[PDB]
Paper text:
In low G + C Gram-positive bacteria, CodY is a global regulatory protein that controls the transcription of numerous genes. CodY from B. subtilis and most other low G + C Gram-positive bacteria is a DNA-binding protein that is activated by the branched-chain amino acids (BCAAs),2 leucine, isoleucine and valine, which may be viewed as signals of the metabolic status of the cell, and GTP, which may signal the energetic status of the cell. CodY from B. subtilis consists of 259 amino acid residues. The structures of full-length CodY from B. subtilis determined here reveal the effector binding domain and the DNA binding domain as discrete entities separated by a helical linker.
We have solved the structure of unliganded CodY in three different crystal forms containing 14 (form A), 10 (form B), and 2 (form C) molecules in the asymmetric unit from data sets extending to 4.6, 3.0, and 3.7 Å spacing, respectively. Examination of the molecular packing in the crystals of unliganded CodY reveals that the basic building block of all three crystals is a tetramer. The tetramer in the form C crystals and one of the tetramers in both the form A and the form B crystals are generated by crystallographic 2-fold symmetry. Superposition of the eight tetramers from the three crystal forms suggests that they are essentially identical within the limits of the data. In the crystals, four CodY protomers are assembled into an unusual tetramer in which four wHTH domains are sandwiched between two GAF domain dimers. For the unliganded form in particular, the tetramer is compact with extensive subunit interfaces. From within this tetramer structure, there is no possibility that the wHTH domains of CodY could bind to DNA in a conventional manner, because the GAF domains of partner subunits in the tetramer occupy a substantial volume that would be taken up by the DNA duplex.
Author numbering:
A (entry chain A), B (entry chain B): 2 to 256
Write the structure that this text describes.
Amino acid sequence: ALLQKTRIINSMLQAAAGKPVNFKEMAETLRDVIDSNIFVVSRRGKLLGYSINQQIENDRMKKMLEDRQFPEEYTKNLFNVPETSSNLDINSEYTAFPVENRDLFQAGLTTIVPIIGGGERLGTLILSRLQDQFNDDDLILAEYGATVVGMEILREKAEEIEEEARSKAVVQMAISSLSYSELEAIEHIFEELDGNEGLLVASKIADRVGITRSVIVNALRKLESAGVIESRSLGMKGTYIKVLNNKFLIELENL
Amino acid sequence: ALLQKTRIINSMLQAAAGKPVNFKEMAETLRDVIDSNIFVVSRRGKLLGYSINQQIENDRMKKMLEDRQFPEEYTKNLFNVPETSSNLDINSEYTAFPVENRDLFQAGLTTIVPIIGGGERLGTLILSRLQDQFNDDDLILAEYGATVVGMEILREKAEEIEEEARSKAVVQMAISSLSYSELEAIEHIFEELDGNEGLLVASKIADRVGITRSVIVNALRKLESAGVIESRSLGMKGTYIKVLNNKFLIELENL
């Protein structure tokens, strides 16, 4: 019953809007829609999700469902596949696969669609039934489905790193905003500290370090200012901090 | 064969990848694989791109094709469509459209798809033949179709501002690294200046402003460093400069 079938696939997509990416509850969707087996493997060939409904004969797939890694020779060509291969097992004649890719498709009549977003193969969609041949409708669905879980990892991954170089801009911001002293204080602080959690009253360092309180006491708050650290001191008599940004200590040690 | 017609689409989708989003050249690729009229209009109702073959009886649409600005009464109810209107003109019986959108659909047995990604109705997609019914799959194409133009405005507008908020980003930079002095200078400079184009001679400012050539002449380079302005000084005897970022000048005035 076509169109609905998809409109349904679409229904699902619209819906992932805010909610962060989630393959499985989306693999399901394809399973449901296409009534097929569904496994999504990334470029690196880690399964990000899959789903099923009845047991199978495929011995050489589970290996990965236990270490997330699939070895540097197997999934390897699984990737070399230039296009969709339509209907597939262990008894059809073709010289499109080399004799080093024998057992990967294995059990349940398997079909294959490459996931292919922003100009790049981001991975593969395995589908694999047992009996019912893979219909022209049935394909069209996957191709949408792939195309969908296409610009999704895309999405997910941008998300994933656009908030790396957030953190990372942040930190060379604040650090960009200290005096030779202030930062030197900060420096000497965490050289003589451990982790985000830190307590040793500023008072102490000053005399040792030979930077006034006043300042040390301040470099400090400059970080309260672009978030990076937290303390809300307890009337001197001890001074404690914890950090709000992992990429920091890192950077700071990068000095 | 519909699938072909679909995969054909796919192929054009991969091959936008690098190339900067082109609507027409996809409006066509629709009007190809669908065999109909394609018109992509937006949230605000601008016709981004379109694509036809024969001559048409819609009068009330040749309006936007010169001002790009559709009425605050037409496109809007065009916006109001909760979902895909399958076939249309002006003889049928329906209590959807409000008594204020009679002639927008005018020519071509018209059909309607809303474009929705980033969990947002990005705009509307308009197909319109003359006789042939829009079939099931005619839809099926059309929709996915949208869905692409879909996450294309996404990519374009995404692209639009990750680079408006670049300018801004770099100018808040450059400036931010200006000593009060230096800043004082660039200031005094452009206040007695007109547009991105300037020839006024450093020597003469210092005095008139109370600052060393030393520093004027420093603060200038600084912005060429961060490229914001161009000058290749001449051997004094007249300095001439140019601004290479619009956002900049704006920002100055906002200090």
